[PDB]
């Protein structure tokens, strides 16, 4: 059967600024780069950045809610979010509707998130403060 | 420090066919559903489906190469691909890289992939036959 996410591939319009964002600013590990892409890891996540002439720099009001959240500990969350803010990283959401989260954009407008907590923790939180119509299986 | 992918959220235009696709066709575990979304898991992956009236059913020629690959074993690959084919799921790309891959579309045009093989396997293949301009770190 399917066993998890093998990799996340993000199309990018300019390879070098995107590598710098994920490696230098977000601290991911860069394993290789080539003329049209790069391979990084973030813990067990395999991230591929793929140079794509079709990728457009997309304002957050023009894209849907599809987004990619990265795990961070409770101890590191606030200072990492504040560092992104001080570095001028654009945002896209302010209301914490799914717990402790910081919502920010990559150079092409990919919607990213820092989040503290697991699915199990979110389900437990939702039992106390459920979303409208929520059912648990 | 970021420790992994916390969750993947896909905006969907119609919640019921998306739940059917991810839970029933793709075999993911449904943990909760509410009026405007659902939480599923696939191995370690926390997947959120978020009902979004801004999501367009998007032909693959009109979206960039951003895509989401799920892990499957080599032994299970061919029968899972055949299941998707029987269900009429559209393919958006043929495989031309190392490791088995099946490139398929979700009901809204999200670009998905079944892939066999790890980052370590890919890096090993690349060291033997580097892409144009490839540098390792
Ligand atoms: C911008 C310049 O071409 C360049 C800088 C750095 C790398 N690298 O670390 O592999 C590649 C290419
Ligand atoms: Mn999220
Ligand atoms: Mn891929």
From TrEMBL, chains A, B:
<dbReference type="InterPro" id="IPR037523">
    <property type="entry name" value="VOC_core"/>
</dbReference>
<dbReference type="Pfam" id="PF00903">
    <property type="entry name" value="Glyoxalase"/>
</dbReference>
<feature type="domain" description="VOC">
    <location>
        <begin position="4"/>
        <end position="117"/>
    </location>
</feature>
<dbReference type="InterPro" id="IPR050383">
    <property type="entry name" value="GlyoxalaseI/FosfomycinResist"/>
</dbReference>
<protein>
    <submittedName>
        <fullName>FosA family fosfomycin resistance glutathione transferase</fullName>
        <ecNumber>2.5.1.18</ecNumber>
    </submittedName>
</protein>
<dbReference type="GO" id="GO:0004364">
    <property type="term" value="F:glutathione transferase activity"/>
</dbReference>
<feature type="binding site">
    <location>
        <position position="113"/>
    </location>
    <ligand>
        <name>Mn(2+)</name>
    </ligand>
</feature>
<keyword id="KW-0479">Metal-binding</keyword>
<feature type="binding site">
    <location>
        <position position="67"/>
    </location>
    <ligand>
        <name>Mn(2+)</name>
    </ligand>
</feature>
<dbReference type="GO" id="GO:0046872">
    <property type="term" value="F:metal ion binding"/>
</dbReference>
<keyword id="KW-0808">Transferase</keyword>
<feature type="binding site">
    <location>
        <position position="7"/>
    </location>
    <ligand>
        <name>Mn(2+)</name>
    </ligand>
</feature>
<dbReference type="InterPro" id="IPR004360">
    <property type="entry name" value="Glyas_Fos-R_dOase_dom"/>
</dbReference>
<dbReference type="InterPro" id="IPR029068">
    <property type="entry name" value="Glyas_Bleomycin-R_OHBP_Dase"/>
</dbReference>
